[PDB]
Amino acid sequence: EALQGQVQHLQAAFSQYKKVELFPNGQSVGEKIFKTAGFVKPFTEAQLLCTQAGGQLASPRSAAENAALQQLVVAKNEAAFLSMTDSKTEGKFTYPTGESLVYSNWAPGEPNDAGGSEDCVEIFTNGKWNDVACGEKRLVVCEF
Amino acid sequence: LQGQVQHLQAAFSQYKKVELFPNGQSVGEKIFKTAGFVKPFTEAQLLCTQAGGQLASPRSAAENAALQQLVVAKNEAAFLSMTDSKTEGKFTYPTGESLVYSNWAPGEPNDAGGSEDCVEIFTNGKWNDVACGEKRLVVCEF
Amino acid sequence: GQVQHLQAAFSQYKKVELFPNGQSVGEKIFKTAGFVKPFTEAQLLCTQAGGQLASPRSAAENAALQQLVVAKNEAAFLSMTDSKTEGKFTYPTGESLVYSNWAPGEPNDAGGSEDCVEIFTNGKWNDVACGEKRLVVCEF
Ligand SMILES: [Ca+2]
Ligand SMILES: [Ca+2]
Ligand SMILES: [Ca+2]
Ligand SMILES: [Ca+2]
Ligand SMILES: [Ca+2]
Ligand SMILES: [Ca+2]
Ligand SMILES: [Ca+2]
Ligand SMILES: [Ca+2]
Ligand SMILES: [Ca+2]
Q1: What are the backbone angles phi and psi of residue A59, rounded to the nearest 5°?
Q2: Cβ within 8 Å of residue A63, ≥6 positions away
Q3: Residues whose CB falls within 8 Å of the CB of residue A127, separated by 6 or more in sequence, listed in order
Q4: Is residue C55 exposed (0-12), middle (13-18) or buried (19+ Cβ within 10 Å)?
Q5: Which domain holds residue A11?
Q6: Ordered alpha helix ranges (H), B53-92
Q7: Which of B60, B77, B121, C2 is the most exposed place for a label (fewest CB within 10 A)?
Q8: Subcellular location, in the record's words (chain B)?
Q9: For the stretch A43-78, what's the b/e string if a residue is b when 16 or more beta carbons lie within 10 angstroms of its beta carbon?
Q10: Contact call for C49 and A13, based on CB within 8 A
């Protein structure tokens, strides 16, 4: 009716503002959306910001998601924190849900738990991962 | 059709969250968004109105708390929309009606120097009537 | 009919989104990244974002775009160039300009190497070297 047109009109407008919102700090891959705050924070504060925002820290589950996330890191020239950690079971990195990694892109020699105190994960401009100290300041990127 | 709507509602809810991060705060049906920079009142007011809204006008503790978090994140006290320019001592909204809520700091408002008709909010959420010429964080409400 | 409720919410977030780095004029939307880049990288960022470099086709559009430049105090790149046919500036589609706001003496192709266009805080245009870093503004 006069309602099958007020929809496609609202979809077209939303389709438009969708792109506007993602530029320049956003990346959409599938039904997931990455957005960076633009600044760096320790893991716990970064995690708190993402969760209070209604999402969680970047959790790349595929090469495609990792690639999209990587482009935000490249644009900022700042390695970013991921949501995954091996705090509970050392050596075993898991998502917020507790399940083990279904995907990984570790840099050569990582993860190494250097100094026996690396339970967090960072992603570089080259897309590779490194387990790092949670106290370090890294780019804050959330997923929605 | 009705089914293609929830899909649009779902998609919207998501981009709603994406938009508000990190410079946005939603409380009820109101939305606060900071520009991230500081400006004198008149320019701050002009930016908010031309953007289709107005300067932050917290009308409750809940709204004041949400607004406060934007100030805390920026570590920059922000301007509110309310002023007592017309009737000194009587602060009002853009509509002209008197305050329905306030969170003045101890000893405020004081109209210090007989020239404080604007209001700022601190990182602790407290208010202070301040000179309108001062540069404060720009936060609009939509 | 729970649409008008969704339209009222979208009208709201539309405003929130555009503040402060956005400008809507007609059905077009300008948004700046806030930083400066050479033309080729600026063009790549806009296109990968789903749009293109700012392409003001009227005085109204040029005025809205100008306010983003003024707010940043940074001249911005437009999408138009005369790389194919020197002296003939065209949009990405290849069609010739339907509007222009050149500064006095402009398109001069200074040094015989100016094929890109920039817009100043006063809204005037200048053909400039594509290698220069200018504010990145896209249109959607
Ligand atoms: Ca450990
Ligand atoms: Ca570890
Ligand atoms: Ca390591
Ligand atoms: Ca007064
Ligand atoms: Ca006063
Ligand atoms: Ca005072
Ligand atoms: Ca040429
Ligand atoms: Ca030329
Ligand atoms: Ca020139």
Answers
A1: -130, 75
A2: A103, A105
A3: A66, A67, A70, A73, A105
A4: buried
A5: 1-144
A6: 61-74
A7: C2
A8: Secreted, Extracellular space, Extracellular matrix; Secreted, Extracellular space, Surface film
A9: beebbebbeebbbbbbbbbeeebbebbbebbebbeb
A10: no
Give the method of determination.
Answer: X-ray
Interface of C with A (CB under 8 A): 1, 3, 6-7, 10, 13-14, 17-18, 22, 29, 31, 33-35, 45-46, 49-51, 136, 138, 140
Question: By the 8 A CB rule, do C121 and C66 touch?
Answer: yes
CA–CA gap between residue B110 and residue B128 (Å, rounded):
8
Instruction: For residue C140, give the nearest of A7, A10, A16 by CB distance.
Output: A16
Contact A14 C14 (CB under 8 A): no
Q: Distance between CA atoms of A109 and A32, rounded to whole angstroms?
A: 30
Which is nearest to B103 in space by CA: B120, B78, B87, B81? B120
Domain count, chain B: 1
Task: State the distance from the centre of ligand 9 to the C-alpha of C91, rounded, in angstroms.
Answer: 18
Strands (E), chain C: 22-25, 28-37, 52-53, 76-81, 116-119, 125-128, 134-139
What is the C-alpha radius of gyration for chain B, rounded to an integer number of angstroms? Answer: 16
CA angle, corner B29, sides to A53 and A38, nearest 5? 30
Is there a contact between C41 and C81 (Cβ–Cβ < 8 Å)? no
Rounded to an integer, what distance in angstroms lies between the CA atom of residue C3 and that of residue B12? 13
Considering only CB atoms, which residues of chain A are within 8 Å of chain B? 3-4, 7, 10-11, 14, 17-18, 21-22, 26, 33, 35, 37-38, 49-50, 53-55, 140, 142, 144
DSSP string over B52-63: TSEE----SHHH
The C-alpha of C4 sits at a distance from chain A's nearest C-alpha, in angstroms, of 10
Task: Give me the sign of the Cα torsion angle C10, C26, B35, A21.
Answer: positive
- Bridge-partner residues for C90, per DSSP? C81, C96
CA distance B12 to B10: 5
| DSSP line for A63-76 | HHHHHHHHHHHHHH
> What are the CA-CA distances from residue B72 to residues B17, B35, B76 (Å)?
20, 14, 7
Read off the CATH number of the domain in which C62 is found. Answer: 3.10.100.10
Beta carbons within 10 angstroms of residue C79's beta carbon: 24
Which of C95, C91, C87, C94 lies closest to C115 in space, CA to CA? Answer: C87
- Which stretches of B1-142 are DSSP H helices? 2-20, 41-50, 61-74
